[PDB]
Design a protein around this ligand. Sequence first.
Ligand SMILES: CCn1c(Nc2ccccc2Cl)nc2cnc(Nc3c(F)cccc3F)nc21
Length: 341
Amino acid sequence: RPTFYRQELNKTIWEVPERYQNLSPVGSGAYGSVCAAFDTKTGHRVAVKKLSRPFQSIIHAKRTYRELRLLKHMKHENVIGLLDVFTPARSLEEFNDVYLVTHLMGADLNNIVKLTDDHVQFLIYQILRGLKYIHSADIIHRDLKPSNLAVNEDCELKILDFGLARHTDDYVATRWYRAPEIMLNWMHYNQTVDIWSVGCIMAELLTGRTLFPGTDHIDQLKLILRLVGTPGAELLKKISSESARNYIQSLAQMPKMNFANVFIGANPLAVDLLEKMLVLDSDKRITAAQALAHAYFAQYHDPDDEPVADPYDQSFESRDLLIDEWKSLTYDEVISFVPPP
Ligand SMILES: CCn1c(Nc2ccccc2Cl)nc2cnc(Nc3c(F)cccc3F)nc21
């Protein structure tokens, strides 16, 4: 079994197999911290995440289990998956730390502000291809924003589950990229909430500006409505919340702007696609599979290399278990891990 070493990196002790060398902080978040490392087995560079306090509560414990489950499942070129998972623990009884290893990508899409239409085509194509895969397993991301999209200098893109709150060397609000139907509650929505976010991102790649930079959830709705217009009866009748129905309607007249105007200069096929992604009504927004068949992506679309995922068991999400139950289940997933070839 591997020999582990210890190293202190900004007040966190890291304990990793000797295989991973040259640990270099990349950043941190509320759910963990991440280093770059060199993997001597493959001669490639990887990212290593040390989960922060994985079993400190039933909510940490459930999150820890979710992340491991989800990441073991993801096997697609445009979705971050697991190269490795490890713990210094030699038994369940000493199990209190979880480390996850993936490809190092070296930047997030937000940093790509530090693009031709072909560039936008390729980036958005890859997001949609990863989303086809995720969505096919009945997984919804629910917080897609540029800081959750890992990108190489190659322009290859992988969807991350969680990005960095702080980078080392060295801001992106969820609500800017969130669909209107989930802006106040979670009562009526499906996988297309992710498609809205894609539209927001695609808009920002085309224009260099945040599309809907709301100062809060009410102002977010106001910026959104200014562009897509006030909804008519067919959408207002599907809204249950009296509060939501009232803000959506209580506006100094909001005309559906001409995406033609808003995005003048763009490939008209981009504008068309944007118009189908940024549809207010969740039930009529284009899906990832439909968006991939859009003529905007004719340079890249190949239906024979846009795979779907194996069946994913999300039943645990309904469960309310004890910390030690989640911990044992997590440990099971750790022990059973089989690395990719
Ligand atoms: C959120 C950090 N992060 C993870 N997290 C993760 C997720 C699931 C399982 C294991 C990990 Cl480490 N994997 C990454 C791969 N590549 C890079 N690149 C990179 C960078 F080097 C600098 C700034 C931004 C970046 F995206 N970041 C990663």
